[PDB]
Amino acid sequence: KSALSKAQKAAVLLLSLPEEVSMNIVKELSEEELQKLFALAKDLESVPEEEIENIAEELLDEIKKAGIKIKKPEEFIENIKKVIPPTLAEKFRGILELGDAEKILKEIEKVDSRILASLLKNEHPQTIALFLSQLSPKKSAEIIQNLPEELKKEVVKRIATLENVNVQYVKELAQILLEEISSLGAKEALKLEGTAVAAELLNTLDKETRELILQSIGQEDPLLEERIREKMFTFEDIRKLSDRDIIEILKVVDKNTLMIALLGAPEDIKQKFLSNMSKRAAKLFLEDMEALGPVKKSEIEKAQRQVVNIIRKMIDEGKIE
């Protein structure tokens, strides 16, 4: 297809070149010749857009070197892009893009028009018009009815003047509106510490059930399991432990770690540890606690979780709970 491709180039040139150049070509060519060139262009194979640009730029360089002046080279490239058809892949891409925009706007169509009107009313009138231009007439009518009066008139006037709309711009507008609705829903909802709620439930469940649930959660998501277990025994739960349990904890925990942990601890938990030490060890502990001076909250928190890590091993070994 070497002579066929040269003929195909001729066909594309005929249709793409400026009319000053190609009017003379048409006059010299017979009707049979012109029709052979038209049939060649019509029967062209489809070519990816990036490859049509390289073909266009080759052709442009080739005819400039052939001795033909091209005043509007970018208009020549676009004309070649009209002649050479697009591929099935490119047709599918456009279809998929259109389908995604449709899916997004269907989700918008489900949303109460009072909510859409409320989210749209402080937007620029041209933005509201561009958005409403893509909705069903009854949706856009419902939204318009829930807008202020002078905005009803201005949005409809701007819709009236539209000659074009960029689909991707409106799609993006719609997705930001869906995220804003999702964000308002979170603000409308009661905040809930799910890891804590799950922890209480598990602590109420018997060990057989509790441990089998957690193990399965850990296999799929080991980070979530751990965040749940952190809530199952907290520093405040030291109150639940016996004096016997505290003695065993005092045998293992570092003094400095315990001192620091107790700086941000309630008074009854302080006394829970202090009452299980000796008179002199307790007295010296309180004295050294004042000796520390200003300690960061992040460090008090760290020492508290360290005591809890130690306490977990007691639950896994000695201390009943």
Swiss-Prot record:
Chain span(s) of sequence motif Part of the EHPQR-motif: 123-126
The keyword Membrane is annotated on this UniProt entry: yes
UniProt membrane topology term: Peripheral membrane protein
GO cellular component: bacterial-type flagellum basal body; plasma membrane
Record keywords: Bacterial flagellum, Cell inner membrane, Cell membrane, Chemotaxis, Flagellar rotation, Membrane
Family annotation (InterPro entries): F-box_dom (IPR001810), Flg_Motor_Flig (IPR000090), Flg_Motor_Flig_C (IPR023087), FliG_a-hlx (IPR011002), FliG_M (IPR032779), FliG_N (IPR028263)
SUPFAM superfamilies documented for this protein: FliG
MF terms in GO: cytoskeletal motor activity
Membrane keyword on record: yes
GO BP field: bacterial-type flagellum-dependent cell motility; chemotaxis
Subcellular location: Cell inner membrane; Bacterial flagellum basal body
Residues at the site labelled Part of the EHPQR-motif: 158
Main location as per UniProt: membrane
SS bonds (residue pairs): none
Stored Pfam families: FliG_C, FliG_M, FliG_N
Chain's role: FliG is one of 2 proteins (FliG, FliN) that might form the rotor-mounted switch complex (C ring), located at the base of the basal body. This complex interacts with the CheY and CheZ chemotaxis proteins, in addition to contacting components of the motor that determine the direction of flagellar rotation.
Classification via NCBIfam families: fliG (TIGR00207)
Family membership noted in the UniProt record: Belongs to the FliG family.
The protein's name: Flagellar motor switch protein FliG
Organism: Aquifex aeolicus (strain VF5)
Gene name of the encoded protein: fliG
